[PDB]
Amino acid sequence: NPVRFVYRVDLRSPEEIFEHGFSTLGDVRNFFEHILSTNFGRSYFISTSETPTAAIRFFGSWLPRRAYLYEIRADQHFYNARATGENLLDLMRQRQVVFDSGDREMAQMGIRALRTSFAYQREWFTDGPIAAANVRSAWLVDAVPVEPGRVVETTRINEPEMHNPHYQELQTQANDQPWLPTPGPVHLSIPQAASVADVSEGTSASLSFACPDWSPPNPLDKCIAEKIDNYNLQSLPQYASSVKELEDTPVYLRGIKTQKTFMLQADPQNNNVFLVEVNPKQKSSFPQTIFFWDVYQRICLKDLTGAQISLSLTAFTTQYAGQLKVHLSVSAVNAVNQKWKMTPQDIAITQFRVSSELLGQTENGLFWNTKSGGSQHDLYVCPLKNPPSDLEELQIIVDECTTHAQFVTMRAASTFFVDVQLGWYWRGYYYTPQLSGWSYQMKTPDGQIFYDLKTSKIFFVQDNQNVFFLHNKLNKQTGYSWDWVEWLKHDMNEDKDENFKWYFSRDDLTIPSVEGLNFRHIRCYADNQQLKVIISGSRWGGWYSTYDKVESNVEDKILVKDGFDRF
């Protein structure tokens, strides 16, 4: 599915933006500077967001304030930031980049920041300005405060949609190529300083989002953010200092009808999410398990498992049609079924409807079955229309004796795993890699094979307590220039050993394939050992790395989940 529309929150009114569109603040086309907000205000790129939720996150800083959420039609001069950076990482690793300024180590610290701290921005950036014929609508967003008695608030996207009569449905779509300075040796300039907007909760924003109302003389006084910080690249922290103010909170929900109150519970041992009825005000008893809601819209279980993984609320389909059931799975940054929205439902702003991004535009909420026995209850996602008469909506209750106000804002992420769902394809058949180093004939399941954005390691989750890392063995002393790869237990935080480090390449590949498949080449950081699979013979499906470019009867196109390099 192509990107047709993007989003951008602005202090300016449709009045202006509807006719002027969005003007660049400069002439410079330097990617790293745009990303890192280096000497801010000079850039030829305008930053947009693949989702409204992402676009307005900066506006939710803790300081009614109001601004305008614009819906923009995307075309061939809109480029995804994350995918653009991954392609440059590939070029640097393959050593085909000439460095006008700075070096590769520094560029990689920037790519790191892009992949982690800034990634939730779901940024699409325009090469040059956005015509008013591009802008299509606008909404009225304001920020109201959560249950009055640092003050926590929520953004609201208000009715009604205001249309731009200068817009023209041109049936275009965002550019699915990564951005390059000289489009058709690539030359790169890497800055030495970064700027970061601290939009509360440890969250970092680039100025190209947090300062939508920029113009030279102090301009920073018009940045919606707790503060702006400056760093040398080597000094750019993962979190903003506001991360230190994070409160822990259990989650309480209340039936719309019955008025019964529940405490969210989750069990990392079997991945169950369930509900347990509680007397409000009266605490203690059942263990108050802790959840947070992060900038990837995930609702995560508080701590990591023995294997250093994170678990998030996941909306699973069932054996029963339009029925969704909440379970835990491994926090993944691109898992749409892990993404939730919260929107207040009462004037007092104490009740929040939780809806799944998985049902896109169909309004939906959380439900339980008001007739179920036992003491623990399943949790469902249902559309708000014709919901079965025996279920009722559960909404998050944020009052004195329930959920803390901090929950209903999006805080910084504790983990940055992409579900890459690696596998391979042979004439209509799908293969999944096994821990043994072999393959098995079946499409790789969701939520099993990951790429850790912090470290560039790839891992295979056997279960919440057992994680294995892909490990290269080949070197210049290996006769024949190939050797098997293997899966090894390893520390999730270990960041020095290059044999555990992998990256993805587009190279010459047709993307997507004639048959719709997302293929990538995969190589090791250490010495560019390429990852491959033997297609047949007595060792069919054996995974290995090689230096040998020209081979027979092996597959070098690896299936990687669509979007893995966009989130």
CA 285 to mean position of chain CA atoms: 36
Q: How was this structure determined?
A: X-ray
Which of 72, 207, 173, 82 is closest to 129 using CA atoms?
72
Total length of the chain: 567
Beta strand segments in 50-152, E: 65-73, 78-80, 97-101, 123-127, 135-145
Residue 233 class from Cβ within 10 Å (0-12 exposed, 13-18 middle, 19+ buried)?
A: buried
Beta strand segments in 303-428, E: 311-317, 324-330, 340-344, 351-356, 364-369, 376-377, 380-383, 391-397, 417-419, 424-426
Which of 301, 362, 295 is closest to 122 using CA atoms?
295
* CA geometry: angle 25, 29, 31, nearest 5 deg: 110
CB atoms within 10 A of CB 487: 20
CA neighbours within 13 Å on the CB side: how many for 289? 18
* CA geometry: angle 199, 118, 54, nearest 5 deg: 70
d(CA 434, CA 543): 9
DSSP state letters, 12-72: S-HHHHHHH-B--S-SB--HHHHHHTTTTT-BSEEEEESSHHHHTGGGG----EEEEEEEE
Q: Which two tokens stand for residue 10?
A: 């602005």
Are 240 and 202 a contacting pair, CB within 8 Å?
Answer: yes
Q: Residue 444 carries which DSSP code?
A: P
d(CA 17, CA 11): 10
d(CA 313, CA 407): 14
Which of 7, 426, 31, 407 is closest to 189 using CA atoms?
31
d(CA 379, CA 271): 13
DSSP state letters, 177-198: SPP-SS---EEEE--SEEEEEE
Which of 490, 453, 455, 452 is closest to 471 using CA atoms?
490
d(CA 397, CA 292): 14
Contacts of 562 (CB under 8 A, 6+ apart): 512, 518
H/E stretch holding 104: helix 104-115
Q: Which two tokens stand for residue 213?
A: 């109302």
Peptide bond into 512 cis (omega under 30): yes
Please, what is the end-to-end C-alpha distance for the chain in angstroms?
A: 15
CB atoms within 10 A of CB 400: 9
Q: Residue 81 carries which DSSP code?
A: H
Q: Which two tokens stand for residue 406?
A: 């901090």
Contacts of 346 (CB under 8 A, 6+ apart): none
Q: Which two tokens stand for residue 481?
A: 């220039």
d(CA 200, CA 242): 5
Q: What are phi and psi of 285, to 5 degrees?
A: 80, -120
- Cα–Cα distances in angstroms (integers) from residue 373 to residues 239, 271, 377, 532, in the given order: 44, 21, 8, 52
Secondary structure of residue 100 in the 3-state scheme? strand
- Cα–Cα distances in angstroms (integers) from residue 162 to residues 4, 68, 72, 140, in the given order: 19, 10, 13, 9
